[PDB]
Design a protein around this motif. Structure first.
Motif, PDB file in Angstrom:
ATOM      1  N   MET A   1       0.807  -1.214   0.000  1.00 55.74           N
ATOM      2  CA  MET A   1       0.000   0.000   0.000  1.00 55.74           C
ATOM      3  C   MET A   1       0.848   1.276   0.000  1.00 55.74           C
ATOM      4  O   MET A   1       0.906   1.871  -1.061  1.00 55.74           O
ATOM      5  N   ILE A   2       1.500   1.827   1.030  1.00 59.42           N
ATOM      6  CA  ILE A   2       2.362   3.003   0.813  1.00 59.42           C
ATOM      7  C   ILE A   2       3.775   2.486   0.547  1.00 59.42           C
ATOM      8  O   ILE A   2       4.294   1.670   1.332  1.00 59.42           O
ATOM      9  N   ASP A  36       6.542   7.263  -1.621  1.00 57.88           N
ATOM     10  CA  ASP A  36       5.800   7.491  -2.840  1.00 57.88           C
ATOM     11  C   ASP A  36       4.324   7.879  -2.623  1.00 57.88           C
ATOM     12  O   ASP A  36       3.427   7.089  -2.301  1.00 57.88           O
ATOM     13  N   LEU A  37       4.076   9.163  -2.821  1.00 57.74           N
ATOM     14  CA  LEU A  37       2.733   9.675  -2.622  1.00 57.74           C
ATOM     15  C   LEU A  37       1.957   9.796  -3.907  1.00 57.74           C
ATOM     16  O   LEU A  37       0.915  10.455  -3.963  1.00 57.74           O
ATOM     17  N   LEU A  65       0.886  -1.201  10.678  1.00 63.87           N
ATOM     18  CA  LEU A  65      -0.346  -0.682  11.333  1.00 63.87           C
ATOM     19  C   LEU A  65      -0.131   0.040  12.614  1.00 63.87           C
ATOM     20  O   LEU A  65      -0.853   0.980  12.903  1.00 63.87           O
ATOM     21  N   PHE A  68      -0.284   3.975  13.190  1.00 66.08           N
ATOM     22  CA  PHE A  68      -1.529   4.741  13.359  1.00 66.08           C
ATOM     23  C   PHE A  68      -2.196   4.728  14.752  1.00 66.08           C
ATOM     24  O   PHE A  68      -2.012   3.872  15.613  1.00 66.08           O
ATOM     25  N   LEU A  76      -8.252   9.543  12.742  1.00 66.61           N
ATOM     26  CA  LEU A  76      -7.054   8.719  12.694  1.00 66.61           C
ATOM     27  C   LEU A  76      -5.848   9.611  12.490  1.00 66.61           C
ATOM     28  O   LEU A  76      -5.905  10.539  11.686  1.00 66.61           O
ATOM     29  N   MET A  77      -4.805   9.455  13.267  1.00 64.46           N
ATOM     30  CA  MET A  77      -3.575  10.169  12.964  1.00 64.46           C
ATOM     31  C   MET A  77      -2.323   9.248  12.870  1.00 64.46           C
ATOM     32  O   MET A  77      -2.366   8.033  13.159  1.00 64.46           O
ATOM     33  N   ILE A  78      -1.158   9.714  12.376  1.00 65.50           N
ATOM     34  CA  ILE A  78       0.065   8.907  12.468  1.00 65.50           C
ATOM     35  C   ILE A  78       0.790   9.244  13.772  1.00 65.50           C
ATOM     36  O   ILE A  78       0.795  10.353  14.304  1.00 65.50           O
TER      37      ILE A  78
ATOM     38  N   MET B   1      -4.234  -3.229   3.247  1.00 61.86           N
ATOM     39  CA  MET B   1      -3.388  -2.773   4.343  1.00 61.86           C
ATOM     40  C   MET B   1      -4.194  -2.240   5.532  1.00 61.86           C
ATOM     41  O   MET B   1      -4.255  -2.975   6.500  1.00 61.86           O
ATOM     42  N   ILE B   2      -4.806  -1.055   5.642  1.00 63.53           N
ATOM     43  CA  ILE B   2      -5.634  -0.759   6.825  1.00 63.53           C
ATOM     44  C   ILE B   2      -7.068  -1.163   6.487  1.00 63.53           C
ATOM     45  O   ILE B   2      -7.597  -0.749   5.437  1.00 63.53           O
ATOM     46  N   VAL B  35     -12.105   1.150  12.337  1.00 62.22           N
ATOM     47  CA  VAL B  35     -10.824   0.922  11.753  1.00 62.22           C
ATOM     48  C   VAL B  35     -10.140  -0.156  12.531  1.00 62.22           C
ATOM     49  O   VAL B  35      -9.976  -0.099  13.762  1.00 62.22           O
ATOM     50  N   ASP B  36      -9.724  -1.166  11.789  1.00 65.92           N
ATOM     51  CA  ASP B  36      -9.001  -2.218  12.468  1.00 65.92           C
ATOM     52  C   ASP B  36      -7.508  -1.913  12.706  1.00 65.92           C
ATOM     53  O   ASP B  36      -6.631  -1.960  11.834  1.00 65.92           O
ATOM     54  N   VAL B  63      -7.606   2.455   2.775  1.00 62.46           N
ATOM     55  CA  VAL B  63      -7.234   3.869   2.659  1.00 62.46           C
ATOM     56  C   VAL B  63      -6.543   4.247   1.347  1.00 62.46           C
ATOM     57  O   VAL B  63      -5.752   3.508   0.777  1.00 62.46           O
ATOM     58  N   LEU B  65      -4.085   6.574  -0.985  1.00 60.59           N
ATOM     59  CA  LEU B  65      -2.823   7.341  -0.796  1.00 60.59           C
ATOM     60  C   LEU B  65      -2.987   8.810  -0.638  1.00 60.59           C
ATOM     61  O   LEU B  65      -2.229   9.424   0.094  1.00 60.59           O
ATOM     62  N   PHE B  68      -2.694  10.894   2.740  1.00 65.24           N
ATOM     63  CA  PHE B  68      -1.421  11.312   3.349  1.00 65.24           C
ATOM     64  C   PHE B  68      -0.725  12.564   2.768  1.00 65.24           C
ATOM     65  O   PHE B  68      -0.918  13.020   1.645  1.00 65.24           O
ATOM     66  N   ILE B  78      -1.651  12.396   8.310  1.00 70.81           N
ATOM     67  CA  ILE B  78      -2.897  12.200   7.559  1.00 70.81           C
ATOM     68  C   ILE B  78      -3.583  13.553   7.365  1.00 70.81           C
ATOM     69  O   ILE B  78      -3.541  14.482   8.171  1.00 70.81           O
ATOM     70  N   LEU B  81      -8.762  11.132   6.020  1.00 75.05           N
ATOM     71  CA  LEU B  81      -8.917   9.728   5.634  1.00 75.05           C
ATOM     72  C   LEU B  81      -9.897   9.577   4.466  1.00 75.05           C
ATOM     73  O   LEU B  81     -11.075   9.932   4.552  1.00 75.05           O
TER      74      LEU B  81
END
Lengths: 86, 86
Positions: A1-2, A36-37, A65, A68, A76-78, B1-2, B35-36, B63, B65, B68, B78, B81
């Motif tokens: 995914m990212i 990579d965004l 995971l 997060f 949700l934040m990082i 992924m999430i 969200v898991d 989610v 990309l 982000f 983030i 979302l």
């Protein structure tokens, strides 16, 4: 995914140092990477390593995971970008 | 992924309203989801929809990309979302 990448020039970290408002000394290790965004090229990102963590070796990574968390306004934040081999 | 999930009870949004400091009125649409995060059960999360967006229907999402962005201290954060069918 990212898609995350640690380039051969990014294989080392630096350490910032200091003291908490309550007297306790700290030390943050940071490293750089490319994320990579989905833009023309990957962007440059600073990540703080967790205590006792070595720098990530060059390679391809994806986000774990545990990076997060739910913030104090309910979204949700990082927390810290935490990486795993791709 | 999430893993993200919109439950049948989460299929509607609410709207908050107001005015920007410079006079311009706004309107935020929010919705809830699960969200898991790899804990005993999924956690509850509030997401703000983008302008012109309908609420997400019940289902399984992951989610996108575009959720982000790099923040002002150089780390990944983030933005909003933003979700896609799983």
């Amino acid at each position: 995914m990212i898609k995350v990448e640690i380039k051969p020039s990014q294989a080392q970290f630096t350490t910032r140092s200091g003291v908490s408002r309550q007297g306790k000394p700290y030390s943050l290790n940071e490293q750089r990477c490319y994320v990579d965004l989905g833009n023309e090229y990957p962007v440059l990102v600073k990540i703080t390593l967790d205590e006792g963590q070595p720098a990530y070796a060059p390679g391809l990574y994806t986000v774990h995971l545990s990076s997060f968390k739910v913030g104090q306004f309910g979204s949700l934040m990082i927390d810290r970008l935490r990486l795993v081999p791709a």
